[PDB]
Design an enzyme around this catalytic site. Structure first.
Site, PDB file in Angstrom:
ATOM      1  N   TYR A  26      50.615  35.875  33.837  1.00 23.65           N
ATOM      2  CA  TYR A  26      50.658  37.312  33.639  1.00 23.65           C
ATOM      3  C   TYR A  26      51.483  38.069  34.680  1.00 23.65           C
ATOM      4  CZ  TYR A  26      47.427  37.592  37.488  1.00 23.65           C
ATOM      5  OH  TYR A  26      46.867  37.522  38.742  1.00 23.65           O
ATOM      6  N   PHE A  36      52.404  45.092  40.595  1.00 24.74           N
ATOM      7  CA  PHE A  36      51.510  44.852  41.710  1.00 24.74           C
ATOM      8  C   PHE A  36      51.118  43.372  41.831  1.00 24.74           C
ATOM      9  CE2 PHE A  36      48.678  46.514  38.271  1.00 24.74           C
ATOM     10  CZ  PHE A  36      47.986  45.341  38.017  1.00 24.74           C
ATOM     11  N   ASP A  37      51.174  42.644  40.719  1.00 26.93           N
ATOM     12  CA  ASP A  37      50.929  41.206  40.744  1.00 26.93           C
ATOM     13  C   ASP A  37      51.646  40.429  39.630  1.00 26.93           C
ATOM     14  OD1 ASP A  37      50.010  38.654  40.968  1.00 26.93           O
ATOM     15  OD2 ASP A  37      47.905  39.143  40.503  1.00 26.93           O
ATOM     16  N   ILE A  56      37.523  41.620  35.693  1.00 23.77           N
ATOM     17  CA  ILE A  56      37.303  43.016  35.316  1.00 23.77           C
ATOM     18  C   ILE A  56      36.991  43.102  33.826  1.00 23.77           C
ATOM     19  CG2 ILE A  56      38.618  44.275  37.083  1.00 23.77           C
ATOM     20  CD1 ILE A  56      41.002  44.114  35.069  1.00 23.77           C
ATOM     21  N   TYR A  93      39.476  48.694  38.030  1.00 24.56           N
ATOM     22  CA  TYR A  93      38.962  48.906  39.382  1.00 24.56           C
ATOM     23  C   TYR A  93      38.461  50.317  39.696  1.00 24.56           C
ATOM     24  CZ  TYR A  93      41.070  44.369  39.856  1.00 24.56           C
ATOM     25  OH  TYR A  93      41.393  43.044  39.681  1.00 24.56           O
ATOM     26  N   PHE A 110      48.919  44.794  31.693  1.00 25.44           N
ATOM     27  CA  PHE A 110      49.121  43.378  31.915  1.00 25.44           C
ATOM     28  C   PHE A 110      49.965  42.787  30.807  1.00 25.44           C
ATOM     29  CE2 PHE A 110      45.323  44.454  34.209  1.00 25.44           C
ATOM     30  CZ  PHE A 110      45.398  43.710  35.370  1.00 25.44           C
TER      31      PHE A 110
HETATM   32  C1  LIG Z   1      39.161  34.929  48.667  1.00 24.35           C
HETATM   33  C2  LIG Z   1      39.154  34.871  47.203  1.00 24.35           C
HETATM   34  C3  LIG Z   1      39.271  36.130  46.374  1.00 24.35           C
HETATM   35  C4  LIG Z   1      39.692  35.765  44.955  1.00 24.35           C
HETATM   36  C5  LIG Z   1      41.176  35.846  44.798  1.00 24.35           C
HETATM   37  C6  LIG Z   1      41.802  34.863  43.902  1.00 24.35           C
HETATM   38  C7  LIG Z   1      40.971  33.745  43.356  1.00 24.35           C
HETATM   39  C8  LIG Z   1      43.268  34.966  43.519  1.00 24.35           C
HETATM   40  C9  LIG Z   1      43.416  35.736  42.213  1.00 24.35           C
HETATM   41  C10 LIG Z   1      44.711  35.366  41.514  1.00 24.35           C
HETATM   42  C11 LIG Z   1      43.321  37.227  42.521  1.00 24.35           C
HETATM   43  C12 LIG Z   1      44.644  37.804  43.016  1.00 24.35           C
HETATM   44  O1  LIG Z   1      44.802  37.665  44.401  1.00 24.35           O
HETATM   45  C13 LIG Z   1      46.170  37.747  44.722  1.00 24.35           C
HETATM   46  C14 LIG Z   1      44.725  39.286  42.745  1.00 24.35           C
HETATM   47  O2  LIG Z   1      44.760  39.460  41.354  1.00 24.35           O
HETATM   48  C15 LIG Z   1      45.153  40.772  41.002  1.00 24.35           C
HETATM   49  O3  LIG Z   1      46.506  41.020  41.442  1.00 24.35           O
HETATM   50  C16 LIG Z   1      45.070  40.888  39.486  1.00 24.35           C
HETATM   51  O4  LIG Z   1      46.235  40.708  38.710  1.00 24.35           O
HETATM   52  C17 LIG Z   1      43.845  41.160  38.878  1.00 24.35           C
HETATM   53  O5  LIG Z   1      43.402  42.491  38.785  1.00 24.35           O
HETATM   54  N1  LIG Z   1      43.093  40.181  38.372  1.00 24.35           N
HETATM   55  C18 LIG Z   1      43.505  38.774  38.516  1.00 24.35           C
HETATM   56  C19 LIG Z   1      43.684  38.216  37.113  1.00 24.35           C
HETATM   57  C20 LIG Z   1      42.451  38.480  36.248  1.00 24.35           C
HETATM   58  C21 LIG Z   1      42.038  39.946  36.198  1.00 24.35           C
HETATM   59  C22 LIG Z   1      41.875  40.534  37.601  1.00 24.35           C
HETATM   60  C23 LIG Z   1      40.563  40.106  38.250  1.00 24.35           C
HETATM   61  O6  LIG Z   1      39.335  40.643  37.788  1.00 24.35           O
HETATM   62  O7  LIG Z   1      40.585  39.278  39.201  1.00 24.35           O
HETATM   63  C24 LIG Z   1      39.390  39.025  39.930  1.00 24.35           C
HETATM   64  C25 LIG Z   1      38.939  40.208  40.747  1.00 24.35           C
HETATM   65  C26 LIG Z   1      39.864  40.869  41.726  1.00 24.35           C
HETATM   66  C27 LIG Z   1      37.572  40.707  40.577  1.00 24.35           C
HETATM   67  C28 LIG Z   1      37.126  41.976  41.230  1.00 24.35           C
HETATM   68  C29 LIG Z   1      36.292  41.603  42.447  1.00 24.35           C
HETATM   69  C30 LIG Z   1      35.652  42.814  43.106  1.00 24.35           C
HETATM   70  C31 LIG Z   1      34.787  43.580  42.118  1.00 24.35           C
HETATM   71  O8  LIG Z   1      34.271  44.708  42.798  1.00 24.35           O
HETATM   72  C32 LIG Z   1      35.622  43.982  40.891  1.00 24.35           C
HETATM   73  O9  LIG Z   1      34.845  44.660  39.915  1.00 24.35           O
HETATM   74  C33 LIG Z   1      35.570  45.661  39.230  1.00 24.35           C
HETATM   75  C34 LIG Z   1      36.270  42.762  40.244  1.00 24.35           C
HETATM   76  C35 LIG Z   1      39.639  37.847  40.879  1.00 24.35           C
HETATM   77  C36 LIG Z   1      39.940  36.565  40.117  1.00 24.35           C
HETATM   78  C37 LIG Z   1      38.447  37.609  41.778  1.00 24.35           C
HETATM   79  O10 LIG Z   1      37.332  37.490  40.925  1.00 24.35           O
HETATM   80  C38 LIG Z   1      38.639  36.353  42.626  1.00 24.35           C
HETATM   81  C39 LIG Z   1      39.021  36.737  44.043  1.00 24.35           C
HETATM   82  O11 LIG Z   1      38.730  38.012  44.557  1.00 24.35           O
HETATM   83  C40 LIG Z   1      44.252  41.827  41.627  1.00 24.35           C
HETATM   84  C41 LIG Z   1      44.978  43.149  41.495  1.00 24.35           C
HETATM   85  C42 LIG Z   1      43.856  41.538  43.078  1.00 24.35           C
HETATM   86  C43 LIG Z   1      43.526  40.065  43.249  1.00 24.35           C
HETATM   87  O12 LIG Z   1      43.265  39.806  44.603  1.00 24.35           O
HETATM   88  C44 LIG Z   1      41.943  40.194  44.907  1.00 24.35           C
END
Ligand SMILES: C=CC[C@@H]1/C=C(\C)C[C@H](C)C[C@H](OC)[C@H]2O[C@@](O)(C(=O)C(=O)N3CCCC[C@H]3C(=O)O[C@H](/C(C)=C/[C@@H]3CC[C@@H](O)[C@H](OC)C3)[C@H](C)[C@@H](O)CC1=O)[C@H](C)C[C@@H]2OC
Length: 120
Positions: A26, A36-37, A56, A93, A110
């Protein structure tokens, strides 16, 4: 709820269901068009379990066809399908967002490719 636009068509037989694991490539952009990603830029596809609140809500809704309830503007995405998901600040978010990367109250776009579901 989220919005899905289908850029391309998959097998049309393989659809994710809640509890299933999907693999996706994606790019994520804002409505203004700034990226942003990107999963491909990293060179690694993203794998997760959908429908469990792992990711999310907008992702959970689009991938599971709203947990099978169905939805307005909610076409289902199948293996090999290319689609665009527009996710409101709700379902993503929210008001806080996640600094640095995402600003407050952001609508997210996305562009995704569903490489596989489960066994595949
Ligand atoms: C140390 C390990 C951390 C671990 C990081 C990874 C495994 C690497 C993984 C590729 C994440 C990327 O890291 C570069 C990066 O992906 C983004 O760029 C993105 O495209 C995104 O939005 N994604 C990822 C693809 C699926 C949808 C969404 C997501 O829901 O992803 C999930 C997400 C952020 C959930 C939040 C968590 C906080 C709650 O409060 C909120 O509730 C609303 C929901 C991800 C999978 C987390 O579950 C897992 C992690 O945090 C974010 C813009 C920021 C995120 O980095 C954080």
């Amino acid at each position: 709820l989220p919005q899905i636009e289908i850029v391309q068509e998959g097998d049309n037989t393989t659809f994710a269901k809640p509890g299933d694991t999907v693999t996706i490539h994606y790019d994520g952009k804002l409505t203004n068009g700034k990226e942003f990603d990107s999963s491909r830029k990293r060179g690694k596809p993203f794998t997760c379990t959908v429908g469990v609140g792992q990711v999310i809500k907008g992702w959970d809704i689009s991938l599971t066809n709203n947990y099978g309830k169905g939805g307005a503007n909610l076409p289902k995405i199948s293996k090999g399908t290319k689609a665009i998901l527009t996710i409101p600040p709700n379902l993503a978010y929210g008001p806080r967002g996640i600094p640095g990367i995402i600003g407050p109250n952001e609508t997210l776009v996305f562009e995704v490719e569903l490489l596989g579901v489960n066994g595949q």
